[PDB]
Nucleic acid binder design. Structure first.
Lengths: 176, 209, 122, 38
RNA sequence: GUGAAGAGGGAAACAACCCAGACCGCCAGCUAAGGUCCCAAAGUCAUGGUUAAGUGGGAAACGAUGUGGGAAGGCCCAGACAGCCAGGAUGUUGGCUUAGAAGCAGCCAUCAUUUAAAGAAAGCGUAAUAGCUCACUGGUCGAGUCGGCCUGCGCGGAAGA
RNA sequence: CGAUGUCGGCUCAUCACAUCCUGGGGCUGAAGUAGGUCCCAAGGGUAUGGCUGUUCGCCAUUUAAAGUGGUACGCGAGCUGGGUUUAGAACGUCGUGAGACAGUUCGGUCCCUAUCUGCCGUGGGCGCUGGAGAACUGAGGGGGGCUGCUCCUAGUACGAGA
RNA sequence: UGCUGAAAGCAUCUAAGCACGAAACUUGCCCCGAGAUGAGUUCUCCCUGACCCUUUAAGGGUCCUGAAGGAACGUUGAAGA
């Protein structure tokens, strides 16, 4: 509602196409196509993007608000992209990467292989830190969540895979 | 992949160099001749129909004689067909030998089990007999109770009772193939297979890989 | 084929001479013990000077069976009686100092080394 | 996770949420205040 | 009052519930209770609202930013509420039960300066300390926002062969 | 009440889930092994003996567990008859007595050739449209679904150590 | 358990959308199965002569031909009351 009433400025060099309710955006990373809710209408609004709820839908304002956030996310992604940093804490933890596959050893008896999806790049500047980049925020969050799910951090030593900018609660055995 | 039709020929054992003896069932798998090839266009599914053995000229009926003559295949006993796996093709009149089992290790054998006739619950469903003494009267091998009371008021379907035992097709799967002899048309498989001597068996590669 | 209530002879010299099997271990509803299965037994009559007295429950291992054992080539080994060796209920550890009579090689489980070593034959 | 029939804001950092028609309480400070049935 | 000693229609079936008291015949009409999408006779009828739960078509104490309406009330472009880079100090390690409670166990006052601004103290956390927040106070965007009462209809609570 | 045989045992079961084991999870005063509690889950599995008529219970030794209930406290036109509950007899107690006692002991006839429904098997008739002989697709239905221990990972992670 | 995400400038697994997630469910394994009257599909085999009648109808009657195949009978079976 309030967020919907805030057009987002489209920077130069970004192409926006409105095929009915489908939106295609092209920047410098790739083409991002998203299908939009039928309860929200969008016009080119040269130099800006505007969203309006069509009459006949009680939640029209809410759908506009989420739609505006999604469009901003894609605009930022195509313009610059999204990066996430993951840290591995624990003795004997490796995060080697090669090609389009991530190799991890989180103390399991067998190696862990993860197949990244298209449009996602992984880099390993250090053996324990891994940085992922992509054109959209939803996929990176999902991929990072999948990586984290392999070894959830535990609250006695903060081991496992953790996000670079999160706080992990720690506790100690009281008597035994 | 397709199977083959063979005849059970008794049982034997093979002595290995290390001493252990392997009980093997001997299956006579002579050349299997393809009589008809099915396709999705006509039959809606792809299969090959094969025949084996021989039949008396005066015993094969005219409808069967014409069916064989169309494929140019000598008349055999019975007909069986196997579904295809989409990875292989066959032509009418082609002969299939036991050599295709050279590279396999497990097979599934299907056949008709020996017929025990009308069998009691003790023999059929391993029911426990009642006491032979201590007052028992005419109830030594009787099934016992078959229902609860008025509340159900009936005997549930699928109840275990006396009846025909054996004489139905059963499959023994994951049998080790011990030896294949193409020139003599033999297939030694470790274990026992359903049916008596001289009964037709169907051998196909194990599906529970 | 040793089941509950079965009489067994004692191969060792722990002082027991006849024992009763009261349970077959190693599985629920297990029926009978094999060549080298652990069983729970009670001593029915022993040497007065022995270290094991009558009416005590302790584990045992079968070494000989009348039914016999089957070899991989089809051969079988049969004996004129059933014999066992006494144990300690916490660690297997046959308490006997010597064992009389032949013992089959089916007990070579990387563990019964003491039994086989003391065995006069095999 | 408490599955009690009554849900309350035990501490300041407790939020009431509705998910799949079920009223839950989520706490960002201590997991002990997380409870499902509301 | 009804049944017993009353058929008929309705409540799926159901003496005693609702409508209604069968003299006989009719391939005539109008109504009662109850009904009108199909089984199954008659409105997929008209107007204004509510419900998202298959509620309707079982069940309470109690719980909750479900949703509709009403009466108000506090703060609000001398610019509110939530956010954003900020501040949150000095004795008050207290006399007091000096074992340490120092604001975070209580006797106790509940003082006082810098002041755009702060209390001798609300939460988490230490044997007490320490430490991290919030009370409160600056600056940008910036317009509504906040907490209760009355209730309509819903959700959870809600497991049996 | 012109008759619905009422405790246990055996045989045979079937359903519910308020789950005993196995499976998936939250919290923990969860270091790890092992636990506590709650949520989801009924696919399968879910002891043998001594004493007593016993169910139950105590005891002995196993298992991953020896689940709780419904089904005429499931099941005697399927079996037994130990308890209780006819007639004999005795003990204690009550009564002058005949006799009585959820007081105790010894002994003591359990019928039925299955018409219908149901269920387990197996056939005849007709139909499916000119008739006949074969091989199939598959709607639909049923069966099966349990798990221990050892080794490697590793004596690794964890832990002051154990 | 989540990712993104407004309603409610924040937050939020949910309202739109996208992910995983159990011996439970559907399938996968084995068996029955077209009486599945919704009675299915494919292959092969056999029959292609004349007279009349009427209330001229998917009608009835007579002569000659009766094929494929089936049944029956016999010898029987590791099939079977």
């Amino acid at each position: 509602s309030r967020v919907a009433k805030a057009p987002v400025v489209v920077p130069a060099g970004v192409d926006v196409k409105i095929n009915g309710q489908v939106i295609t955006i092209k920047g410098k990373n790739g083409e991002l196509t998203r299908t939009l809710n039928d309860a929200v209408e969008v016009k080119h609004a040269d130099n800006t993007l505007t969203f309006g709820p069509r009459d006949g839908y009680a939640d029209g304002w809410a759908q506009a608000g989420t739609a505006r956030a999604l469009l901003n996310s894609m605009v930022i992604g195509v313009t610059e992209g999204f990066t996430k940093k993951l840290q591995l804490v624990g003795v004997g933890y490796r995060a080697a990467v090669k090609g389009n596959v991530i190799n991890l050893s989180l103390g399991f008896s067998h190696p862990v292989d993860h197949q990244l999806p298209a449009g996602i790049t992984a880099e390993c500047p250090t053996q324990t830190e891994i940085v992922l980049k992509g054109a959209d925020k939803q996929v990176i969050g999902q991929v990072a969540a999948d990586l984290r799910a392999y070894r959830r951090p535990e609250p006695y030593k903060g081991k496992g895979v953790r996000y670079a900018d999160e706080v992990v609660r720690t506790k100690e055995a009281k008597k035994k | 992949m397709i199977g083959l039709v063979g005849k059970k020929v008794g049982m034997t054992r093979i002595f290995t160099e290390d001493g252990v003896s392997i009980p093997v069932t001997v299956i006579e798998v002579e050349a299997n001749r393809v009589t008809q090839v099915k396709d999705l266009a006509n039959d809606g599914y792809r299969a090959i129909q094969v025949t084996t053995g021989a039949k008396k000229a005066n015993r094969v009926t005219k409808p069967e004689a014409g069916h064989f003559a169309k494929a140019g295949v000598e008349a055999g006993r019975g007909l069986w067909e196997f579904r295809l796996a989409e990875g292989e093709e066959f032509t009418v009149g082609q002969s299939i030998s036991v050599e295709l089992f050279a590279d396999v290790k497990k097979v599934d054998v299907t056949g008709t089990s020996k017929g025990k006739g009308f069998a009691g619950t003790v023999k059929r469903w391993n029911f426990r007999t009642q006491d032979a003494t201590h007052g028992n009267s005419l109830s030594h091998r009787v099934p016992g109770s078959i229902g609860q009371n008025q509340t159900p008021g009936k005997v549930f379907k699928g109840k275990k009772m006396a009846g025909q035992m054996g004489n139905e097709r059963v499959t023994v799967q994951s049998l080790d193939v011990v030896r294949v002899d193409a020139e003599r048309n033999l297939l030694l498989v470790k274990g026992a297979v359903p049916g008596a001597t001289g009964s037709d068996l169907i051998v196909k590669p194990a599906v529970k890989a | 084929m040793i089941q509950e209530q079965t009489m067994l002879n004692v191969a060792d010299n722990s002082g027991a001479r006849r024992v009763m099997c009261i349970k077959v271990l190693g599985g629920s509803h297990r029926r009978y013990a094999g060549v080298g299965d652990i069983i729970k037994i009670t001593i029915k009559e022993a040497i007065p000077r022995g270290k094991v007295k009558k009416g005590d429950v302790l584990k045992a291992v079968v070494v000989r069976t009348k039914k016999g054992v089957r070899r991989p080539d089809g051969s079988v080994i049969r004996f004129d009686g059933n014999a066992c060796v006494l144990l300690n209920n916490n660690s297997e550890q046959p308490i006997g100092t010597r064992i009389f009579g032949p013992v089959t090689r089916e007990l070579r489980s990387e563990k019964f080394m003491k039994i086989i070593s003391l065995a006069p034959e095999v | 996770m408490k599955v009690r029939a009554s849900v309350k804001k035990l501490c300041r950092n407790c939020k009431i949420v509705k998910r799949d028609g079920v009223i839950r309480v989520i706490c960002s400070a201590e997991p002990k205040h997380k409870q499902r049935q509301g």
